[PDB]
Structure formats: structure tokens, C-alpha cells
């Protein structure tokens, strides 16, 4: 019985004053306390004050911080259902990925509802029928990746140049980009429906390596300098090191695998199954996998905190759940009306973006 | 493509892969020379010119050659109209209005009231100006003029100067103003004009809005309103003034504090209109201001506006960069504006700003945020704060890098006898600095009672000077030393000082120090003879069993007078729990105790609650957040709650009580013999079943005051039940900690109904922020 | 007086206004601007700040304008003052 109620979100003071001035003109021509949300200062911070804590922390342990609540500030409008989002905290440029079109937005301007993007990019103009499923961003913000189903290749855009243009088509004619991946190395990774993975060098645009497996096994892919992780409908789990070029571990499950995650400060591997079980595995000792959290709804996306303390989940059941690493228990809850497909996180740890229905929403983190 | 900056918002969408090359007009130096030429230079050239130059919006407008020429000729007009115009001209709005007024007088044979026909024309053209502003249309077709009964010939004849010029190459004609600034000014003029008289009978019908808002704020000047009354023979009282005052008041008050950007924007808007009554009426309810400064114009406007702030008591100002350096000399014009001022412009303005800050009487708290001050910067700040009329009694430097001006700070300490609380933090403190600070503190003029040194680097020599300061006769009552590694020999030196009977220190804080079980034992043995220490804090330092035994022995000694004892994250053994329970069985003058991140078993919990059950207990507050607990001890907890008569505050944290445990606790609570006020549960793994018992207990709990339920899964129906329990007249639950974003629409509406029913109920996620009593004396 | 400067797409239109201007001697600036404009573009992108150089006055003084967020302007002026300090030694 959710019975959800929707209200204007920001209620910014400038908007309130503008609304007040608009009414007076209409009244003149007709003859013929209040709570406002703090704006995003310069598109970087909110400038709020932190919350109190029951006790002081240890002198050595100052950097470890955990969040409490999430507050939404802006809503981004796209007429079609969105599939992926990108943050790009350095340039304050948010990218929204949908089935048909891609748009780019800037967070400098203050507005309740954003309808006009700074740049609009569509891949359906080039070909007769273009269906897009995947997208990816680079840490250096010098490249933008977008893969499609019937699109013959993958298109790279560069944000360093004064103008946006297509770098290379990098064709995969018979293979649809179910999975798209990238690394710190210049090297490109991608997975497709027919259990095939083909690998190209951006500098020279040549195929260097091909991998083959059973069908539906390329639904997921995890990249590391010495670890390549692969799993799909089969539920076989394979870890590969390019150096000695052989599968390291094989693992079996009762159901399919969709979600994987990695932790930067110390390796941990998170598993999401069709029956809704979260399994955690450490990549140092390499002994055993363990499960601590179970969800009735299928889990589609996952992400980890830059600090290495909390992970938030997005699933079929229109819910957002955030946990912690020591026990796996959830610490706060925020539900949404639509089925949440995507998720995102910021390297700075101040913002967060999630999208379920055609439009996208931007939230703010409190510490 | 050529267009305005405002039009790029729409254009950036349809155009594919465009290029942007920005066009700029007059250079800054040439503009400065041109403005300097027009200055009358009659003893106010420096101040007026400097006020003109810093205004960024004014120079953005003056970048236009036509606007620059208009400003120049207006300045020339002010020379001739030395006595006719009484108001000063430091703003664009005043200058443009002055030119409009002077031009109108040229058409009039003499100063007289406007005729009826021309007033209709003026209000009509002003209203189409406002309509064009709101509709974002500027073509101004002749059809609109006939719709409102306007003629171009009449407009050009009565105005006597070029307004809304039309040129038609083809058959059709289009009307364009001389500049957009004039059009916005006329729209602002209409926004006051409609109130005076109704003219609908004759008619037959957000960056861009920023200029209109600024013009509207400027037009509220009394002299302009008086002049308009003179032209129209009707007293001018606009209804928008109340709306502006209401908007400013709404900005002034907020639950979580004032955003600095909104405050500075309001200051900019109020400074535009040079009226003392307007600003005074606008701002009365701040009570706390947070300010960010990045330009000298900010300093000037803050100095102008702080005079009318007679209500505020706390101020926080951040200037990161404007005084990072002490000396820097550069000249903008080819020839200097002033021959020799012997001081650059920034220093005089900041001196005036600090004099204004120190002049206020209602203000008694000062904070510098993360300011980075040079040596001369800290010197001038101290010199301005040296004023006798200043009554600021608190200073904070825990985030300010002022190590260069520590000498000036020490000079400030003894000179001002009024301030009491002084805080220093994250400032590397050197040996001669310690010596000077201690010598200044020893001075009889010093009246500082509280001094704090957190993360301030300390030497062994520093420790011995600190001990000599303590043994010396001072007025220091409270002292803290946190996150400072202390040597055992230094600790021995500190201990000897404490054992002295002449020492009179009431609050001592030791957190994250280098305490060891031997060091802790020695410290407690030294403190055994002390009798003037009421508040003592020891956290994050390992404490042995013998240390706890010696501490309990000291507590048993009379004349101890130690009210609050705080211990967290220090490992406590099982036997030490026995000593603590024996002390608690017959304890007086010991109200508050804390234990957090400490291994406490369920049997130890039973022993503790049995010790509390004894009638000779005066422990008001007990905190046990991260102590590992299970569901078995909850029955004894309920029993002790029912039996206890003096426990007021009880807190529990990450310990998993369990559903049955909470059920038993609420069964014990619903009988409501206990007079406890605050109950805290967080991440206790709650379910929807215990909510019925919780609502039942609340429904017969008039004593209960505060409650927290965070990080616990609560279903929808549980939320309705709890809201209904809140709405019952029997419940008096005022402080409640919950996250509203987690729940559905119906729960939010129910909570709004609860707030409607009881005007004194507040729901906020940050439950720990509220403090009924001083609990964070050590945390600060 | 009309000056045309290309504006990078990433910079917001709002940031361009309220420019910070620093006055420095022309000879030092000639060296300060550097021989290559590509490194100027690279530091511009990695700092997200806009700078323009122009000196027409007969005197040795020159004027420098920086465009962008206050933090970026602060870091630009810090770098330029460090370069000037290196020059005076």
C-alpha cells in the first residue's frame, strides 16, 4: 500500500521569489515556516554541517566515514527509459544513457527540472536501426564509450578536444555488446551474446586477443590488471590472468550470476544471484565464498564505496539498499516508485545518481 | 552565429558540434582611465572610484561602449547638478534614474505635475516593457503599441531623448530600445507604477531576471520614491516591498542554519538601495551569520550591512586567500589613481571591516573557519580586535592557519580582559611560542578560564613548561590535551603537578594520549590526593585492572567530588566490572558514566543491573552503545528499569537486543513505574511485531520525552501504529529521531498530522544533536 | 575594442563572468606564457580555468585575466605568483 505522494523537490529560495513575482503580474493584469533545500554550491558541494556522533574516533582512524541518509536535489528529464548514467565528478558533467539517445548535462546551473541538455548525442542517425545497451567512462575523462545491440561497433568520444567527435567505429558486426569493459591500461574489453570476447588496442585499432566460452557467459565481466573475471547463465566463475594466460579458478552456483563488485583498498568480490543471494569472496587468500544477505527480488546492479566501507544495491523490487562490509547488514533504506535498473557513485563521495523510469534523479549524501 | 550569453541555453541543444568564441569590449585599463577622467576628484575620488571598480556587475554593464558613454555623461551631469540631487550615485540604478529624471525636466518648461494623457502613455510603455521582460520578447511590434494605445511619435516627443527607436527597411517596422538595461529599468519602474492607480480602462488587452531583481531592489530608494511622488503628485507605497522583506526574512531563518551564498546575495541586494530603514526592517531575525568572502566588494558590503545587524550574536567568516600574502604592490592604471596612500586599498577596507566586526555589542562569538592569514593579516586583525568597546568573549582557531601571527595572538590575549573561552587546534606550537603563551597567561590581566590544545605538537620541554604553568597561579579552570603523545617522564612531570594541593582545575580531558597501564596507574595514584577535579575524561587509552582498582579506591575516598567520568574504547576486564558494580552499589556524587566499544558479557550486564537495582544509586545517565549484548539479559534489564528510581537516560547501540528482548523491554516499560526520559535504539534489528507493544507502552507513558529508532526495519503498518500512538493525548514524546525519506506517502502525511496535532514535536534524523544537558564538554 | 578568444566547450558560460585580473611586468610574462600554446591548452584542461594575455600599454606592466570557479582562480594566481617569485631570484 505505498500510496506515494510527489512534491516539488528543491523549493529553492530563488524559485520561490520568482514565483512570487510572477503572481503579482498576473494579479495586476487580471482585472483586464517555509522550508528550502540548500542549493548545490558551484555544482561541487552543498556546504552543510556534519552530524554529531555518540563518541570520538581513534586518532589513527580519522578517514573512515559512513553515510546516514540520501537527499535528492535535481531531476533530469529524458522522454525514454534510461539504462546507464555516468558521474565525471572532475568535470561536473553527468551523462545519461538510454535505449535510443544519449544526453550530456552540467551541474553548474541551479534549476528544479532540467529539460535542456548541454549536448545531445544519438547513434540512430548513422544506421537504420540502432539499439543501445551499454556505456562506460574513463577515469581520465578523455574517452566516452557506448555500445549497442544492432550497432555494428562501439564509438569513442573525447572530452579533451574543444568539440565532440567520433574516434573509431571498432566494428563488431555479428556480436551485440552485452558487456562493455575498460581498464587503466589502454586495452579494451567487451563481451557479447554468443560467448565471445574480442579485444582491441585503441592506439593502433587492431584485434590482439579473442576468448570463447559457452553462450550467455559474457553477461558480466570484471577487469583487473592481473585478474579477468567471467560468468553468466551457466554460473561458472572463471578468473584469468593475462600474464600466464590461463583460467585460475572455476566456481559453480545453483542459479545465474548478474552482479559483481570489487573493492579498491582490499579485494572483495560480491555475487548477485537470480534467487537473490549476496555472496562475498576475498581475492587474496582464495579459499572460500560466503553469503550473508538474501533479497527476494532479483538484484541487477551493484557498486562499492571509494573508502571501502559500504555498498549499495539496486534490484527489480523498486528498492535501494545500502549495506556495510563488516557484517553485510543494511544501514538505511530509500525506495522509489519505478524499477531501478542503474546506479552510480562519485569518487569524491558527495553525490549519487540513480535512475528507474524515463527520467533520472540526483541525490546528495550526508555524513 | 552571433547572440547573447542568455540565448546559449537553448541553442546548445539542436546545434551539432559547435564552437564558442567569446567577444569582449573595452579593456579594463582603458575603462579605468575613462572612469578616472569623469571623476570630479573633490576629496572623494579614491573611495567613490574604488567602490565603482570592484562592482563586477557594474563593470559587466560598462563593458558596453554605449553603456560606458552613458555612465560617463551621467557622471558629467552630477557635476552640474551638485545641489539639485541629494542622493549619492554609487550604483547603476541611481545613475540611470538620475538621467531619466533630468531628461524629463528638460521636456517640461518647469517642474510640474504630469498631464493625464502622458501618464497613460508612460504606464503603458512601462507595462509593455515588463511584459517583454516576462515573455522574453524584444521585437516590440507596432501592433502591441496600438493594443495598449501607444504612439511612437508621442513617446519620442515626451521623453525628449531616444527611447524605443524603430527602423523599418521593408514595409513592416520593429521597435528596439537603446539598450536592454533601459528596458529592464522601465520594467522595474512599472513594477511600482501599477499600485498607484488602475490604468486598465485605457488599455485594450533566471540570469535575465537577476537584472530586474537588482533594479527593483535599487528602485526602493526613498529619494527615487519621493521623486516619483513629485512627478505624479501621488504618494508612492508599493506592495512589492512587503514581499521583498518577507523573502529576506524567510532566508534569515532555517532549521539547519543559514547558507552563506544566500546571505551574501541578500547583502548585495540590500546594499544596492542606500536606505538605512529598509535594511534595518529587512534583517532582524538572523541570530547567526555564516559568511564567505572572496572579493573586496564582499568586505565593503559586509561592513555596510553588519552595522544594521543589531540582533546577531555568532559570526563565522572564511577568507582563504585574500591575505595569504602580507605584502604585494601592483598598479592597474598607467598613472596611479592616488600619488601616495602609503597603504594599498585591500588593507584599509579589511581594517574597516574588522573595526565594524569589533564595534558590535550584541556579538560575543567569533570564528575564523579555515582562514589562511599572513603575518600582517593576523597583526591587523589583532589590532582591530584590541578595541575596548568589543565584547566578544569566545575565539576559535582550530581550523585557522595563523602560526605566523602567534606573537600577535599572544599580545591580544592579555590586552583584552573581557574574553573567557579560548580554543586553539591543529596549530604547530613551538618552544618559544609555548614560553610566550605561558607568560601571557600568567599575566593578572588574563581572564581566560578555558584553554584547549588539540593536535598541537608538544615537546617534553613543552610538557614541563605546561606543568610549571599549571602549578603557577592562574585563572584556568578547564584544560584539555587530546591527540598528543605524552612521554612517561612527561606524564610523571604532569602527575607531580596535579598532586599539588594548590592546583584548582575542575575539568581535565585526556583523549588519544600515550597512556599505558603503568602510566595510567601512576596518573591515578598521583590524582588520589587531588580533590578539586569534578569532571574527568579518559578515552582510547588502554587501562589495566590495577588501574581500575586504584581508580575505584580513589572514588571510595571522600572529598572526591567527581561527578562525570567518561571511559570509551578502553578495554575493561571482568574483575574491573565487579569493582565498578561494588562502587555503584553505594555511590554518591557520581551522576554520569559512559562505556562504549567495551566487551561486556550478558553475565556482566546482569551484575551491573543488579548493582543498579540497589536504592543507593544516583546514576542519572548510562551509555552502552557497542557493548555486545544478546536477548537473554533483556528480562533483567526490564526488571531493573521497573525497580530503578533514579535512572533518567538509557542508550543502546549496535548491540542486537532481538525481537523477544524488545518485547520484554516494552512489557517492562508499559507498566511505567520508571521515570526514565530518553531511550535510544539504533541498528538493534527491529521488526514489525514489537511495534504493537511499543505503541501500547507509549500510550501510557506520560513521562517519556525522547526516543530514537534508526537503522531498524519498520513496515508500513508499524508506522501507522506508531503514528497513532504519537497522536494520542497521553503520549508526550517530543524528540523523535527517524529518516522521513525511507517511508511512503501515507506515513509522511501521518507525521505531518502529528506535527499539526502537537506543535512541539520535531522529527529529525540527527538525534544526537539535541543535548538537554552538557554531554559534549569533552568532545568540543 | 573587440577581442575574440575561443572558449572551451567544458567551461560553463556562468564561470566566464566576474574575472580575476593580475598585473605583472611584461618581460617576465613573455617567459611566463611559455613558448608553446599546446601546454597552455593542457594546463587549461587539467585546471578547468581560462586565462588570456594582452599588453598594449607603453609601460612594463601587463594585465592577466583568469576565468572560472574561485578555487581554480586561486590556484592559477598561486602558480603565477610562484613563477614570479622564481623570476625575481
UniProtKB/Swiss-Prot annotation, chain A:
Keyword tags: Cytoplasm, Nucleus, Phosphoprotein, Repeat, Transcription, Transcription regulation, WD repeat
GO molecular function: structural constituent of cytoplasmic lattice
UniProt effect for mutating residue 91 to R: Impaired formation of the subcortical maternal complex (SCMC)
GO CC list: cell cortex; cytoplasmic lattice; cytosol; nucleus; protein-containing complex; sperm midpiece; subcortical maternal complex
Induction section of the entry: Induced by E2A-HLF, a chimeric transcription factor containing the transactivation domain of E2A linked to the DNA-binding and dimerization domain of HLF. Induced during TNFSF11/RANKL-induced osteoclast differentiation.
Subcellular location: Cytoplasm; Nucleus
Modified residues (Phosphoserine): 305
Highest rank taxon of the organism: Eukaryota
Gene Ontology biological process terms, A to Z: actin filament organization; endoplasmic reticulum localization; epigenetic programming in the zygotic pronuclei; establishment of spindle localization; flagellated sperm motility; mitochondrion localization; negative regulation of transcription by RNA polymerase II; positive regulation of embryonic development
WD repeat segments: 33-69, 77-115, 127-167, 170-210, 213-250, 252-291, 294-333, 335-366
Deleted gene: phenotype: Females show normal ovarian histology, ovulation and egg morphology, however fail to produce offspring following successful mating. Progression from one- to two-cell embryos is delayed by 4-6 hours and embryos failed to develop into morulae and blastocysts. Embryos form unequal sized blastomeres due to smaller, dysmorphic, and displaced mitotic spindles resulting to asymmetric division.
Main location group: cytoplasm
Domain notes: Contrary to other WD repeat Groucho/TLE family members, does not contain any identifiable Q, GP, CcN or SP domains. Only the C-terminal WD-repeat domain is conserved.
Family statement: Belongs to the WD repeat Groucho/TLE family.
Protein name (record): Transducin-like enhancer protein 6
Species per Swiss-Prot/TrEMBL record: Mus musculus
Positions spanned in the full protein: 146 to 581 of 581
From Swiss-Prot, chain B:
PTM: Phosphorylated by PRKCE.
Top-level division of the source organism's lineage: Eukaryota
GO BP term, pick one: fertilization
Effect of residue 687 to I: Decreased interaction with TLE6
Induction remark: (Microbial infection) Reduced by T.gondii in the testes and uterus.
Gene Ontology cellular-component terms listed: apical cortex; cell cortex; cortical granule; cytoplasm; cytoplasmic lattice; cytosol; Golgi apparatus; mitochondrion
Signal peptide boundaries: none
Effect of mutating residue 696 to W: Does not affect interaction with TLE6
Record family assignment: Belongs to the NLRP family.
Reported function: Component of the subcortical maternal complex (SCMC), a multiprotein complex that plays a key role in early embryonic development. The SCMC complex is a structural constituent of cytoplasmic lattices, which consist in fibrous structures found in the cytoplasm of oocytes and preimplantation embryos. They are required to store maternal proteins critical for embryonic development, such as proteins that control epigenetic reprogramming of the preimplantation embryo, and prevent their degradation or activation.
Protein name, entry field: NACHT, LRR and PYD domains-containing protein 5
Organism: Mus musculus (Mouse)
From Swiss-Prot, chain C:
Highest taxon of the lineage: Eukaryota
Keyword annotations: Cytoplasm, Nucleus
GO terms for cellular component: apical part of cell; cell cortex; cytoplasmic lattice; nucleus; protein-containing complex; subcortical maternal complex
Main location class: cytoplasm
Tissue distribution: Expressed in ovaries, where it is restricted to growing oocytes, with greatest levels in fully grown oocytes.
GO process annotations (BP): actin filament organization; embryo implantation; embryonic pattern specification; establishment of spindle localization; establishment or maintenance of apical/basal cell polarity; fertilization; in utero embryonic development; positive regulation of double-strand break repair
KH domain span: 19-80
A molecular-function term among this protein's GO annotations: RNA binding
Localization per Swiss-Prot or TrEMBL: Cytoplasm; Nucleus
Induction, as annotated: Induced by etoposide.
UniProt note: phenotype after gene disruption: Embryonic death at 2.5 dpc. Progression from embryonic 1- to 2-cell stage delayed 6-8 hours. Less than 20% of the embryos progress beyond 2-cell stage. Embryos form unequal sized blastomeres due to smaller, dysmorphic, and displaced mitotic spindles resulting in asymmetric division. Decrease in thickness of subcortical F-actin in zygotes, thickening of F-actin bundles in the cytoplasm and loss of F-actin cytoplasmic lattices. Decrease in CFL1/Cofilin-1 expression in the subcortex and diffused distribution in the cytoplasm of zygotes.
Role: Component of the subcortical maternal complex (SCMC), a multiprotein complex that plays a key role in early embryonic development. The SCMC complex is a structural constituent of cytoplasmic lattices, which consist in fibrous structures found in the cytoplasm of oocytes and preimplantation embryos. They are required to store maternal proteins critical for embryonic development, such as proteins that control epigenetic reprogramming of the preimplantation embryo, and prevent their degradation or activation.
Gene that this sequence comes from: Ooep
